[PDB]
Each structure stands twice: as structure tokens, then as C-alpha cells.
Amino acid sequence: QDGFILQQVKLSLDDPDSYLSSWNSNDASPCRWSGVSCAGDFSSVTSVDLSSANLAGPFPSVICRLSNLAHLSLYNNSINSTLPLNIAACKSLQTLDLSQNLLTGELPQTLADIPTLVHLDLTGNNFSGDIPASFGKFENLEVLSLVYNLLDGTIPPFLGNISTLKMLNLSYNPFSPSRIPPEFGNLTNLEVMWLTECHLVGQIPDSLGQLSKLVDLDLALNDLVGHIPPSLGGLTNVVQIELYNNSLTGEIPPELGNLKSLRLLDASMNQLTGKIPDELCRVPLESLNLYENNLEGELPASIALSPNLYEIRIFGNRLTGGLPKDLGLNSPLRWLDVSENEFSGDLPADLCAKGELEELLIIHNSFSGVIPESLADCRSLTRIRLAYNRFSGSVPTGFWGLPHVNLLELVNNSFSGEISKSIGGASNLSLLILSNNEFTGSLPEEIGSLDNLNQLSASGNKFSGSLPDSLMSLGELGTLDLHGNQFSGELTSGIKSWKKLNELNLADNEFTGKIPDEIGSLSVLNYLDLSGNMFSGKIPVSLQSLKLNQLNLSYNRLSGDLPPSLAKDMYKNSFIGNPGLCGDIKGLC
Ligand SMILES: *[C@@H]1O[C@H](CO[C@@H]2O[C@@H](C)[C@@H](O)[C@@H](O)[C@@H]2O)[C@@H](O[C@@H]2O[C@H](CO)[C@@H](O)[C@H](O)[C@H]2NC(C)=O)[C@H](O[C@@H]2O[C@@H](C)[C@@H](O)[C@@H](O)[C@@H]2O)[C@H]1NC(C)=O
Ligand SMILES: *[C@@H]1O[C@H](CO)[C@@H](O[C@@H]2O[C@H](CO)[C@@H](O[C@@H]3O[C@H](CO)[C@@H](O)[C@H](O)[C@@H]3O)[C@H](O)[C@H]2NC(C)=O)[C@H](O)[C@H]1NC(C)=O
Ligand SMILES: *[C@@H]1O[C@H](CO)[C@@H](O[C@@H]2O[C@H](CO)[C@@H](O)[C@H](O)[C@H]2NC(C)=O)[C@H](O[C@@H]2O[C@@H](C)[C@@H](O)[C@@H](O)[C@@H]2O)[C@H]1NC(C)=O
Ligand SMILES: *[C@@H]1O[C@H](CO)[C@@H](O[C@@H]2O[C@H](CO)[C@@H](O)[C@H](O)[C@H]2NC(C)=O)[C@H](O)[C@H]1NC(C)=O
Ligand SMILES: *[C@@H]1O[C@H](CO)[C@@H](O[C@@H]2O[C@H](CO)[C@@H](O)[C@H](O)[C@H]2NC(C)=O)[C@H](O)[C@H]1NC(C)=O
Ligand SMILES: *[C@@H]1O[C@H](CO)[C@@H](O[C@@H]2O[C@H](CO)[C@@H](O)[C@H](O)[C@H]2NC(C)=O)[C@H](O)[C@H]1NC(C)=O
Ligand SMILES: *[C@@H]1O[C@H](CO)[C@@H](O[C@@H]2O[C@H](CO)[C@@H](O)[C@H](O)[C@H]2NC(C)=O)[C@H](O)[C@H]1NC(C)=O
Ligand SMILES: *[C@@H]1O[C@H](CO)[C@@H](O)[C@H](O)[C@H]1NC(C)=O
Ligand SMILES: *[C@@H]1O[C@H](CO)[C@@H](O)[C@H](O)[C@H]1NC(C)=O
Ligand SMILES: *[C@@H]1O[C@H](CO)[C@@H](O)[C@H](O)[C@H]1NC(C)=O
């Protein structure tokens, strides 16, 4: 009969990829059929897995006529229409996975009438309306997943009545704004509470502290208010706490230090105040994210003790004092973001000791001293932002040439010395921002070797000498800003090679000679500033062809007529401070 029933399933579904080709009526048994598994001396179908088969059409309710069917998966198909109340006919089902389908309408209340059901996954469907009251009466359910549906009812307290529940997954539903039922604290066996983006309102219940077996608490992306409960110290087995993007206030409880198994804490994007507790930092955390809060005081040195720490993101706070001296020495630190704080003192000497540091983001702080010499050997680095600090000294030779660095931002510091020839080694460099420093010397020829470079901003420095001829080799360059320097010499026909250049700013330098006619060849140039230089001769006629939002050729030695487009009252400020250009425009001189 199992074969005949499965033939009825086949006739009820669209099978464009012929996944059910093997479903042959002439077969003695259906056990060898695609997606079918049998058990017992009877060769009874016990499992059907038609996942990722590109099957389409309504749920095949006739499949429930299989007496011994214990596992059904139609995961990742185009199963559509409503889930029938006839699903209760599947009385032997232990696991049901209908995730990633096109199922619509209300959840059938008869799902709770399957006593054997342990796993229910309806994730990634279009189910809407209230969660049925029957769902409170599930006999043996351990996993309930309704993630990414259109459920628009309130979160029901009766879900707390499922004593056997180990995972409650209701994340990513447009639920009517609802408080977390305190009855959820009575789910003694619960290991996962996943309520991300569930339109939660009100305060986290103290009852949630009763969940001794909880491994993951996720209440992120909601409108939760009030304080993180000190009762959460009762979460003995918790490893992950996600409270990010809420409206939580008050201080981080020191009782979080009692959570020995805690490795991941993210309470970022809240209104938390007070200091980060030493007790929490004593826990050997893997990730601590407390960014975009109103936290103050020092970062406890105990955080450096963790052997598992790879991530610290505490940016956008009012934290003071120095970073821990041993930070990175005992941990595989990968991501460090302490930006927009009040941190001071030298950077820790061994941030990259374990050789895994990828992101060093410390902008808008009062960090001082020289870049640690160890960081010159940190080849793992991909993004470096030391901008808006009080750093001094030369940038270490190795630091310039780090191979995987895509962004090097040293803007607004007191950095001195020269860009080393080692910069040629920076194959991955796309953005180089060194503006507002005391850098000296000439740009190295090795800068031209950086084919991937898109931005070179080094304004407000003491750079000098002729631009390297290799600078033409920067075909991918979109921004070149060298204003407020002592750069000398002349531009060449090589500037034509800057095909993708949108901005050229060489203002307030000592440049001499004619502006090359090849300036017109730069099709996407929208910003040109050559002001405060000694550029001489006629303005290139080709400049008319360029569409420029900003043009400044002021305070130069330029002479002769303007192209007709540029000869306008609006462009007077662009050509002031040039004796030769006088009388090109009425009221210029
Ligand atoms: C439920 O899915 C049925 C199977 O269709 C295929 O899979 C869909 C997910 C979609 O990719 C579709 O393009 C596939 O053809 C639909 O049936 C059919 O509808 C299509 C037009 O969309 C038609 O060309 C087919 O001949 C027709 N086949 C069968 C066996 O009915 C259901 O569609 C609905 O009913 C149709 C008769 C038609 O009136 C259509 O407008 C309806 O949407 C799908 N039902 C729902 C509720 O979406
Ligand atoms: C109910 O929700 C929980 C929490 O989202 C789901 O649990 C978790 O499942 C994911 C995906 O399987 C796990 O992620 C990964 O880690 C493993 C290594 O252990 C790795 O191989 C994967 O590539 C992935 O990175 C996650 O660790 C796990 N978390 C917990 C706390 O258990 C659960 O699957 C959901 N159940 C249903 C039916 O929706
Ligand atoms: C979790 O289950 C407990 C046991 O059923 C609840 O406690 C009890 O409360 C009942 C009324 O809600 C009462 O009839 C029971 O006699 C009592 N049982 C025991 C052993 O205490 C508990 O409810 C809460 O705690 C009690 C003391 C009251 O303060 C109630 O207002 C609470 O809701 C359940 N917890 C939750 C959060 O529902
Ligand atoms: C969901 O099922 C579909 C259909 O089996 C999977 O789609 C295909 O992806 C594989 C691997 O990239 C390709 O070789 C096939 O050509 C694709 N087929 C179709 C019809 O798109 C899809 O990968 C599955 N998704 C998941 C997350 O498992
Ligand atoms: C809470 O859960 C219990 C246990 O699943 C539910 O209890 C039963 O109620 C159903 C239908 O009313 C009966 O068929 C069962 O025989 C009852 N079993 C037991 C062990 O009492 C109870 O209804 C649920 N309550 C809520 C509000 O959902
Ligand atoms: C970044 O550095 C620049 C240059 O030092 C700062 O800009 C100027 O502000 C100072 C006063 O603090 C003036 O005396 C200068 O004339 C300004 N220079 C220029 C070129 O505009 C800028 O304020 C700094 N930004 C931050 C956030 O610290
Ligand atoms: C081109 O650059 C010159 C020099 O920086 C600019 O000149 C001055 O204009 C500003 C704003 O009106 C005044 O505050 C300064 O006093 C002027 N300085 C001098 C030395 O004259 C000019 O405005 C810029 N023009 C454009 C179009 O950007
Ligand atoms: C499911 O809901 C989404 C979002 O409202 C919509 O874009 C999609 O077309 C819906 N699909 C079905 C089958 O109702
Ligand atoms: C945080 O939530 C707000 C809505 O309150 C949303 O606009 C924003 O994109 C979210 N940001 C992150 C990083 O989750
Ligand atoms: C370049 O840096 C980016 C991150 O900015 C990274 O994803 C990429 O893998 C790097 N590529 C190389 C070749 O280092």
C-alpha cells in the first residue's frame, strides 16, 4: 500500500526536474525510490526526504496514509497553498520539515494533535494570523520553528506550557507588539530562545533567569526597555546572549560574571550606562560587543586574560583610560573596534601576537605614542583606522607594505617621516588616507605599483618633490588629493592614464609648467582644484569638454583666452589671482 500511496503523492505534485522518475509502480517495494527510506521486516516507509527537488503544488496530504511515516522533509521546494488540517493523519510523525516553501494561510491547529511530533520546522513560509491555542498542548514537541513567516498575532503565553520544548524559534515575524510572557521562564528544558525581530515590547522578565539549561538567549532587534535583569546570572549553561538593537537602559549586571559558559555577549545599540563589570571581563569570552551605548569608565584588564577572545567592538561609548597592556597576548584577537571613545595612552605592544588581527579600528580617541613595531609583522591585517588620535613618530617600514591591507587611514595624527618604498608590497591597498599629519619626503615610485589603489588622500602634510612618473600607472584611481603640501615639478601627458579619476586636488602646492591638454581625456572627472600653484600657459581647451561640479585654477600664472563654456560670471572665482586671465570675464580683475 506504501507504494500506491507514494504514487498518489507523485500524481499530486509538479516534478519539472523528474526527481520522481524512480517512483515506478512495477517495483515490488518503494524503498529504493528517490527520497524514500524503509525500516523493519515489513519494508514500511518510515522517512520521506524530497528536500531541494524543485517540487511544486499543494502539500500532498495523502502521504499521511503511510502508517509508519516518522520523518517528512519537503525543505526548499515550491510547495504552496495552505497546510491542510488533515496533517493530523500523520500520527506517527516525529520530525516535520516544510521550511523554505510557499505555504500560506493560518497554521493548522491539528499540528498539536500529533502526539509523536518532536521537531516542527515551518521556517521561510508565508503563514499568517494567530499561533493556535492548540500549540500550548503539544505532548512531546522539543523544537518549534516558525522563523521568517508572516505571523501577525501577539506572542502567546501558552507556548510556555510546552514542558518538553528545547528550542523556541519565532524570529523574523511581523507579530503584533507583544511582551515576552513571564510564563516562558517555566520552559525548564529550553536551550534556545530565538525572538530576534519579533516586535517585542516592555521589559525582559526576571523569570528568564530560571532557564538553567538555556544555551542561547536572543532578544535582539526589538523595542525592549528597562534593565538587563540581574536574575540572568541564573543562566548556568548560557553561551550566547544577544540583546543588541533594543532600548535597554541601566548598568550591565555584575551577575553576568557568574555565567561560566558565556562566550558571546552582544548588547550593542542600547542606552546602557555605567561601567563594564570586571566580573563579566573575568569570564573567558570569545566576543564582547557593547558598541553604541552610553557606557563610561575603564575597560577592565581582565578581558585580556581570555584565551578565546577574537572580537571586541565597544565603539561609540565614553570609555576612558588605556587599553589592557596584555590585550592580544593570550587571545586570537581578529576584530578590535574601540572607536569614538575617550581612550588614551600607547596602543598595547602585542595586539597581533597570535597573528590573526584583521581589523584595527580606534578612530576618534586620544591614543598617543608610536605605532607598535610588532604590527609591522601583522600580515593578517585587512583594515587599519588609527585616524583622529594623538599618534606620533614614523610609520614602521613593515606597516606600509602589509599584503592584505585594503584600507590604511592615519588621518588627523602627528605622524612624521616618509612613505617607505615597502608600500609596493601593499598589493591589496584600495584606500590610502594620510591627510592632516607631518609626513615629509617624496611619494615613492613604488606607489605606482599599487594597481588596485582607488583613493590617495595625503592633504595637509609636508610632502615635497616632483610626483613619481609611476603615478600614471594608477588606472583604478578615483580620488587624488595632495592639497596643502610642498609638491613641485610639472604634470605630464601620463595623467591621461587616470581614466576613472573623479577628483584631482593639487591645490596649495609649488607645481609649475602648463596644465596638460590630456586633462580633457579624464571623462569622469567632476572635481578639479589646481589653485595656489605656479601653473603657467593657456588653460587647456579640452577642460570645456569635462563636466565639473567644482573647478579652481585660481592663484596661478595662467594666461590667454578661456573656452566659451568656462567664460561665465559663475566661473570668475575659479580664475581669480591670474594676471594673464584678466579680461577673459567681466569683473575678474
Ligand atoms: C501552486 O503551484 C502550482 C504549480 O505551479 C508551478 O509552481 C509554481 C510555484 C509556479 O512556479 C508556477 O509557475 C508553476 O507552474 C500552480 O499551478 C499552475 O499554475 C500555473 C500558472 O501560475 C499554470 O501555468 C499551470 O498550468 C498550473 N498547473 C496546475 C497543475 O494547476 C498553482 O496555481 C494556481 O492555480 C492555477 C490553476 C492558476 O489559476 C494560478 O493563477 C494559481 O496561482 C499554485 N497555487 C497558488 C495558490 O499559488
Ligand atoms: C533554532 O534556532 C537556533 C538558533 O539560531 C538554531 O541553532 C543553531 O543552528 C545553526 C545552524 O545549524 C548553528 O550554526 C553553525 O555552527 C556550526 C558549527 O557548530 C557550523 O557548522 C555551521 O556552518 C553554522 O555556522 C548554530 O551553532 C546553532 N546554535 C545553537 C545555539 O544551537 C536551530 O537550528 C534552530 N532550529 C530550527 C529548526 O530552526
Ligand atoms: C511557573 O509554574 C509554577 C508552578 O505551576 C507557578 O507557581 C504557582 O503559581 C500558581 C498560580 O499562578 C499557583 O496556583 C501554584 O500553587 C504555584 N505553585 C508553586 C509551586 O509555587 C509559577 O507562577 C508564578 O509564581 C507564583 C508564586 C505567583 O507569583 C504567580 O503570579 C507567578 O506567575 C509559574 N511561573 C510563571 C511566570 O507563570
Ligand atoms: C534548494 O533547491 C534548489 C533545487 O535543487 C537548489 O538549486 C540549485 O543549486 C545547485 C547548486 O548551486 C545548482 O547546481 C542547480 O542547478 C540549482 N538548481 C535550480 C533548479 O535552481 C538550491 O541550491 C537549494 N538551496 C539550498 C539552500 O539548499
Ligand atoms: C498545557 O499542557 C498540558 C499538557 O500538554 C495540556 O493538557 C491536557 O489537555 C488536553 C486537551 O485539553 C488533554 O487532551 C490532555 O489529556 C491533557 N493532558 C494532561 C497531561 O493534563 C494543557 O491543556 C495545556 N494548557 C494550555 C493552556 O495550553
Ligand atoms: C583634523 O585636522 C585638521 C587640520 O589640523 C583640523 O582642521 C582645522 O581646524 C583648526 C583648529 O582646530 C584650524 O586652526 C585649521 O585652520 C583647520 N584646518 C583646515 C585645513 O581646515 C580638523 O579640525 C581636525 N578634525 C578633527 C575632528 O579633529
Ligand atoms: C579657489 O581657491 C581660492 C583660494 O583658496 C578661494 O579664495 C578665497 O575665497 C574664500 C571664500 O570666498 C575667501 O574666504 C578667501 O578669503 C579667498 N582667498 C583668497 C586668497 O583670495 C576661492 O574662493 C576658490 N574658488 C572656488 C570656486 O573654489
Ligand atoms: C509571501 O510574502 C512575501 C512578502 O509579503 C511576498 O513578496 C510573496 O509574494 C508572498 N508569496 C506568496 C506565495 O504568497
Ligand atoms: C537597528 O534597528 C533600527 C530600527 O530601530 C534599524 O533601522 C537599524 O538598521 C538596525 N541596525 C542594526 C545594525 O541592526
Ligand atoms: C583585500 O581586503 C579585503 C577586505 O577589505 C579582503 O576581503 C580580501 O580578501 C583581501 N584580498 C587580498 C588578496 O588580500
Numbering used by the authors: 18 to 606
What does the primary publication say about this deposited structure?
Here we demonstrate that HSL1 binds IDA/IDL peptides with high, and CLE peptides with lower affinity, respectively. Ligand sensing capability and receptor activation of HSL1 require a SERK co-receptor kinase. Crystal structures with IDA/IDLs or with CLE9 reveal that HSL1-SERK1 complex recognizes the entire IDA/IDL signaling peptide, while only parts of CLE9 are bound to the receptor. Our work reveals that HSL1 is a receptor for IDA/IDL signaling peptides.
To characterize the sequence-related HSL1 receptor, we determined the crystal structure of the apo HSL1 ectodomain at 1.83 Å resolution. HSL1 folds into a superhelical assembly of 21 LRRs with a conserved ligand-binding surface, suggesting a shared peptide recognition mechanism with the receptors HAE/HSL2. To quantify these interactions, we titrated IDA and IDL peptides into a solution containing isolated HSL1 ectodomain, using isothermal titration calorimetry (ITC). In contrast, we did not detect binding of CLE9 to the isolated ectodomain of HSL1 in ITC assays. Structural superimposition of the CLE-receptor PXY25 and HSL1 highlights that HAE-type and CLE-sensing receptors have evolved different peptide-binding surfaces in their LRR domain: HSL1 features a set of bulky amino acids in the N-terminal part of the binding surface, incompatible with specific CLE peptide perception.
